[PDB]
Curated annotation (Swiss-Prot):
Nitrite binds at H64. The keyword Zinc does not apply. The modification Phosphothreonine is found at T67. It comes from Physeter macrocephalus (Sperm whale). Residues 1-147 form the Globin domain. Its EC number is 1.7.-.-, 1.11.1.-. Monomeric heme protein which primary function is to store oxygen and facilitate its diffusion within muscle tissues. Reversibly binds oxygen through a pentacoordinated heme iron and enables its timely and efficient release as needed during periods of heightened demand. Depending on the oxidative conditions of tissues and cells, and in addition to its ability to bind oxygen, it also has a nitrite reductase activity whereby it regulates the production of bioactive nitric oxide. Disulfide bonds: none annotated. This is Myoglobin.
Length: 153
């Protein structure tokens, strides 16, 4: 369970993401695909993309990243009270997309990397610790739902 102080550190950096969610989204998914290329294979819609330049140029990818970060932002804003938000997300990611917990760890790494790079003013050590805790909570709660849904993860 995160403290209110920890949630405020999470939300204060998220406020900066929201200046330009699309640009942050592109950076995060591209970082994921670069660091862990196997993750790209889960996206039938995007797996044809060969290079960072192609990824950056894809309007379709950009739009998807906005969807992803907006969904995550809505979860974070619930400050742990995210049961309603996690239900549809866990179901689609377990049963339609088949995304293991390991891959959610990878995207968490990418989020932390991009925030660390872009936002040193709001992503010092304590703030990064808080974001790590928030993403760990998200992954733990998704993992529990995965199990309930019949997916090993
Ligand atoms: C922060 C974690 C993530 C969030 C918040 C998130 C959110 C979303 C949302 C909102 C959608 C559209 C609605 C839906 O199908 O549920 C989506 C679709 C999808 N997600 Fe995720 N996602 C996350 C992580 C991942 C990861 C790590 C992968 C793969 C490695 C992945 C694979 C997919 C795929 C393949 C789709 C369908 C794309 C399409 O063909 O339109 N997701 N995601």
């Amino acid at each position: 369970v995160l403290s209110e102080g920890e949630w405020q550190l999470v939300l204060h950096v998220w406020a900066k993401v929201e200046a330009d969610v699309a640009g942050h989204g592109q950076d995060i998914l591209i970082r994921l695909f670069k660091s862990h290329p196997e993750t790209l294979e889960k996206f039938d819609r995007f797996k044809h993309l060969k290079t960072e330049a192609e990824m950056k140029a894809s309007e379709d990818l950009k739009k998807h990243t906005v969807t992803v970060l907006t969904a995550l932002g809505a979860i974070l804003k619930k400050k742990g009270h995210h049961e309603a938000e996690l239900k549809p997300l866990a179901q689609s990611h377990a049963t339609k997309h088949k995304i293991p917990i390991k891959y959610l760890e990878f995207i968490s790494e990418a989020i932390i990397h991009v925030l660390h790079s872009r936002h040193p003013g709001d992503f010092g050590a304590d703030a990064q610790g808080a974001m790590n805790k928030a993403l760990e909570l998200f992954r733990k709660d998704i993992a529990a739902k995965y199990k309930e849904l019949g997916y090993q993860g």
